[PDB]
Amino acid sequence: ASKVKQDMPPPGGYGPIDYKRNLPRRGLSGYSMFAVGIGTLLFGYWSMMKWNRERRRLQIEDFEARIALMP
């Protein structure tokens, strides 16, 4: 009492197979990206402004010490 056994799909078939493209958006807006860039530029400019003014004062102090020693 043996029945035919063969490679067949299961009853009801197989599940759906995805084949469509699935490239998502996954990104901010151009406006927001440009805003972030401008903001970091401005923060950097402000920090460099203060630091370079301080460096100019330090250079003036060193030059004054040299002038005092020069004679």
Partner 1 sequence: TYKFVNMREPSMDMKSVTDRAAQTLLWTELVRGLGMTLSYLFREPATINYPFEKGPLSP
- Give the total of residues touching partner 1 (CB under 8 A): 8
Return the one option of ligand PEE, partner 1, ligand PC1, none that residue 29 interacts with (CB less than 5 to 8 A, by type). partner 1
With CA atoms as reference, report the closest residue to 47 among 35, 59, 37, 39. 39
Residue among 22 and 29 whose Cβ is closer to partner 1? 29
26 lines the binding site for partner 1 (CB under 8 A):
yes
Output the CA–CA distances (angstroms, integers) from residue 50 to 3, 19, 24, 36, 43, in the order listed.
90, 58, 44, 22, 11
Instruction: Kindly tell me the sign of the dihedral angle through the C-alpha atoms of 40, 43, 45, 47.
Output: negative
How many residues sit close enough to ligand PEE to count as binding (CB under 6 A)?
Answer: 3
Which residues of this chain interact with ligand PEE, rule CB under 6 A?
Answer: 37-38, 41
Which residues of this chain interact with ligand PC1, rule CB under 6 A?
Answer: 26-28
